[PDB]
Scaffold this active site. Sequence first.
Site, mmCIF file in Angstrom:
data_model
loop_
_atom_site.group_PDB
_atom_site.id
_atom_site.type_symbol
_atom_site.label_atom_id
_atom_site.label_comp_id
_atom_site.label_asym_id
_atom_site.label_seq_id
_atom_site.Cartn_x
_atom_site.Cartn_y
_atom_site.Cartn_z
ATOM 1 N N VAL B 48 0.994 -1.174 -0.120
ATOM 2 C CA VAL B 48 0.216 -0.064 0.080
ATOM 3 C C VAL B 48 1.067 1.135 -0.081
ATOM 4 O O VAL B 48 1.530 1.664 1.033
ATOM 5 C CB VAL B 48 -0.956 -0.122 1.174
ATOM 6 C CG1 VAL B 48 -2.030 1.303 1.284
ATOM 7 C CG2 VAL B 48 -1.675 -1.357 1.381
ATOM 8 N N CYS B 49 0.784 1.881 -1.076
ATOM 9 C CA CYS B 49 1.730 3.034 -1.599
ATOM 10 C C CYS B 49 2.959 3.065 -0.923
ATOM 11 O O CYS B 49 3.551 4.045 -0.347
ATOM 12 C CB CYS B 49 1.020 4.442 -1.239
ATOM 13 S SG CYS B 49 1.368 5.843 -1.954
ATOM 14 N N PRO B 50 3.885 1.927 -0.954
ATOM 15 C CA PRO B 50 5.227 2.116 -0.836
ATOM 16 C C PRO B 50 6.153 2.924 -1.531
ATOM 17 O O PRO B 50 7.051 3.806 -1.469
ATOM 18 C CB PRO B 50 5.909 0.704 -1.096
ATOM 19 C CG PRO B 50 4.891 0.153 -2.148
ATOM 20 C CD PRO B 50 3.542 0.700 -1.859
ATOM 21 N N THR B 51 5.365 3.579 -2.938
ATOM 22 C CA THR B 51 6.096 4.359 -3.840
ATOM 23 C C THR B 51 6.345 5.800 -3.410
ATOM 24 O O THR B 51 7.215 6.486 -3.809
ATOM 25 C CB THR B 51 5.303 4.237 -5.093
ATOM 26 O OG1 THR B 51 3.854 4.635 -4.852
ATOM 27 C CG2 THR B 51 5.387 3.115 -5.840
#
Lengths: 166, 167
Positions: B48-51
């Site tokens: 979940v949204c590691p970016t």
Amino acid sequence: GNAKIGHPAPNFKATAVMPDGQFKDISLSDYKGKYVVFFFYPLDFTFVCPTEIIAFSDRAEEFKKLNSQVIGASVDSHFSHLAWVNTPKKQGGLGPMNIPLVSDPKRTIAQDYGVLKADEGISFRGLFIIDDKGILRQITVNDLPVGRSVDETLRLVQAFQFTDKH
Amino acid sequence: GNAKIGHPAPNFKATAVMPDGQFKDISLSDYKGKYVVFFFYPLDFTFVCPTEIIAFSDRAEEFKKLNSQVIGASVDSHFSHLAWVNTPKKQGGLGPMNIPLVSDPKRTIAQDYGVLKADEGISFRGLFIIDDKGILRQITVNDLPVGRSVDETLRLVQAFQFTDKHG
Ligand SMILES: *C[C@@H](NC(=O)C(=C)NC(=O)c1csc(-c2cccnc2)n1)C(=O)OC
């Protein structure tokens, strides 16, 4: 205050200046079934980032497309709100609004949202995203000199709605 | 917690994994004289949204131009942080970092910043902007599934710096 992510957002009942230019007593629970963006600003007739209110209002259509309601609030009286709305933008007013402006004269809504600047009796620049079930999803609090981005707020609302679809 | 706008940001001392890949004990007060962006993310190896972590790292130069420091944090161990850093990006890793990642295993930093999810023992997606004097200027807290914008963070930092110089 009592604002906690993943818990019911603190309810309030307050006199607001509605988009039609009349007073009405409204509660946050009235908006169940819709996303709510609820934001505080320090004072009516402020020279510090008043245009953020106008920008939320001007771009109400983009929030409508997301089935979301925008509500502004300050500690000023409902009569102050009305005066500001009835002042044309050409003269430094808000002009007509597409959003309700809540009055928090007891400072209790600001206190419940954890955004009272106690040494001045005004709210910080808080913004809160509540989902359609009344659960608080997002807390934003800026110190007084820096305003909010409508683009950022729309991104957040969309992202919460998208992740709700899972 | 104890994070209040206009008041000293809660200090911490913690083990971080630094950009060079080594552990170091750092404090927030070490960064006095600079703007600090301090952000929490829930767990290492999250889908979940590691970016957002990679984005803050990739755009470190833009924070340097603002004489500002970015610090990330989660409740995971410094060992977990480094493993994630050493995992190639094409395999779901962070890759090499331009920012320190703090370890908060006692959950005390999360608690101090008011971003502990008590029922789970992880931090919400909190982000905090602290000025060069150590005073907290901005609180951002997202529920777990929604990440942070680097552009928004840059806007806030520069805007606070500009308004510091001139009302
Ligand atoms: C009232 C208005 N005030 C400011 O924006 C202010 C003091 N802004 C800045 O100093 C600033 C630095 S970079 C930036 C920016 C904004 C939007 C897009 N790109 C850059 N602003 C406010 O905050 O209302 C939103």
